[PDB]
């Protein structure tokens, strides 16, 4: 029930930490997996929802396994392969292998689909999907912050622009933070919308009753936690080259 939610201290004592992997290093391995997921995903022509789902698989998977044992470059393809079947956009195993390969090795060229080397890496992926399902305890139904952002942003008539920026923050929270391991999706959504508003210099007006916009999204959410969380997300956004540029007002 609160199985896949973790404290800051459980996030410190990760499986990766046992095997020597620095905290900061781990955060990168997560971001690189996320990146590889997004790259493979756009080429494979699956939805952002599938990529998001695969990203959460990755995130959970490394709270149980270690990066020192399962490299993100091996786990990411298999996770996306699974996620695409689970999200109803199945892609063929040969197909995910071919795309995973071109992303990891733009220069090399795919082995012979007849060889013992290609026949192997197909099995490695099939074995890894199996290891992922077992690590996740077959819990494949993932709830994403986006669902809840798109709810609220309408029920406050945000500009098309503010809504897009909220979706943006949502997706980027999956690549850049471990929020999906720490906070429920509706809360993550509030963080996304709150930061989006601060960034677009948009103020959402206190509903007629006296309640703040967020209390219509999650009873637990305080403005103290919203400010703490947007600051974290904003900071990692600023460290990430070219991201903020995408939502920046150049006018």
């Amino acid at each position: 029930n609160k199985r896949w939610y973790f404290t800051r201290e459980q996030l410190e004592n990760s499986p990766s930490r046992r095997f020597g992997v620095d905290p900061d290093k781990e955060l990168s391995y997560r971001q690189q997996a996320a990146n590889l997921l997004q790259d493979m995903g756009q080429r494979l022509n699956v939805s952002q929802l599938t990529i998001n789902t695969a990203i959460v698989y990755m995130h959970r998977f490394y709270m149980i396994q270690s990066f020192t044992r399962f490299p993100g470059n091996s786990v990411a393809p298999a996770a996306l392969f699974l996620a695409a079947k689970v999200e109803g956009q199945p892609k063929k195993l040969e197909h995910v292998i071919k795309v995973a390969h071109t992303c990891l090795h733009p220069q090399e060229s795919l082995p012979d689909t007849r060889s013992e080397a290609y026949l192997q890496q197909v099995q490695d992926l099939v074995i890894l999907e199996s290891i992922i399902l077992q690590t996740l305890g077959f819990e494949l139904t993932i709830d994403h912050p986006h669902t809840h952002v798109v709810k609220c942003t309408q029920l406050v008539r945000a500009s098309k622009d503010l809504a897009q920026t909220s979706y943006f923050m949502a997706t980027n929270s999956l690549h850049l933070t471990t929020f999906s391991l720490q906070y429920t999706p509706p809360v993550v959504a509030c963080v996304c919308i709150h930061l989006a508003c601060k960034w677009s210099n948009w103020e959402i007006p206190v509903s007629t009753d006296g309640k703040h916009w967020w209390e219509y999204v999650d009873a637990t959410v305080t403005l103290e936690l919203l400010d703490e969380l947007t600051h974290e997300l904003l900071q990692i956004l600023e460290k990430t080259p070219n991201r903020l540029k995408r939502i920046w007002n150049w006018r």
Partner: protein
């Protein structure tokens, strides 16, 4: 060896018997090594499967994890060593009981069955799932007399280009045979119709051999398929292949007028005029003497 906090080895359970064959492997009765709790182990095998873990099995697992209700089979967990779906064990099944001339239902009981049935449907449709395999063989009952909707291997979610060859032939509704692909919950309710009639006749009422034979056998029970009966049934393409032109056929077996009225509202040709699980639960059948009674 790799850590596995959330997927227990099936050695957990002690096997007692094969009890069926699956689409990916054998089905066993089995017993918790510690508490003796009885479960059904339904194996899933990956050899003839070329795309890794079967997408079709993932769907079932996804659906079963979502549906938690008194009248729907309970998936307890998934186990490893291959992969096994672990279910709560269910002693009987509507089909087998109907086949057994030894076993006999009162009117009071048959009502209770139809009630638990219709309530399981109310639930799964309310959760945006179509069963799609309604038939007596898929209605289970436990030792304590509780009916479980079972076997969601053909089930899918809903909200309009859905697949056509679904539901075993005898239980399949007019609209699917007429080539419909924008169907909803009513296809399951047609199935509840044939299952209900089956509760007296002891025998699947409409046994076909081909799609044109079933669709004909249907007409010689529910009347010809005409736009006067089924507004805009014309629009359907396959409607140009084998034309033709119910309470009296079942009058004999059933006798009770209420039972008969409901079965007529369930076996209605126009999917939009066919009764839903909600109105059926409310139908006089469940609310007039003798009231529905528990099972022994």
């Amino acid at each position: 060896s790799v850590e596995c906090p959330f997927c227990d080895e099936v050695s957990k359970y002690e096997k007692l018997a094969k009890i069926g064959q699956g689409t990916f492997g054998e089905v066993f009765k089995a017993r918790h090594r510690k508490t003796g709790q009885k479960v059904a182990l339904k194996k899933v095998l990956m050899e003839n499967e070329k795309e890794g873990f079967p997408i079709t099995a993932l769907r079932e697992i996804k659906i079963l994890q979502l549906l938690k209700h008194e009248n729907v089979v309970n998936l307890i967990e998934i186990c490893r060593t291959s992969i096994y779906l672990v279910f709560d064990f269910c002693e009987h099944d509507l089909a087998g009981l109907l086949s057994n001339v030894l076993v006999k239902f009162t009117l009071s009981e048959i009502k209770r069955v139809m009630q638990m049935l219709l309530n399981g449907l109310y639930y799964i449709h309310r959760n945006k799932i179509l069963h799609r395999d309604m038939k007596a063989a898929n209605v289970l009952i436990t030792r304590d007399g509780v009916l479980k909707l079972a076997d969601f291997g053909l089930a899918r979610a809903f909200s309009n280009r859905y697949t056509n060859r679904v539901v075993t032939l005898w239980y399949r509704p007019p609209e699917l045979l007429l080539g419909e692909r924008d169907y909803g919950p009513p296809i399951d309710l047609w199935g509840a119709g044939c299952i209900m009639a089956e509760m007296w006749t002891r025998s699947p009422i409409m046994q076909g051999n081909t799609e044109q034979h079933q669709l004909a056998l249907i007409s010689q029970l529910c009347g010809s398929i005409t736009p006067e009966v089924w507004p805009n049934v014309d629009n359907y393409e396959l409607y140009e292949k084998l034309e033709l032109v119910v309470k009296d056929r079942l009058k004999a077996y059933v006798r009770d007028p209420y039972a008969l009225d409901l079965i007529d509202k369930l076996l209605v040709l126009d999917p939009a005029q066919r009764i839903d699980s909600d109105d059926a639960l409310n139908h006089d059948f469940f609310w007039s003497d003798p009231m529905p009674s528990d099972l022994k």
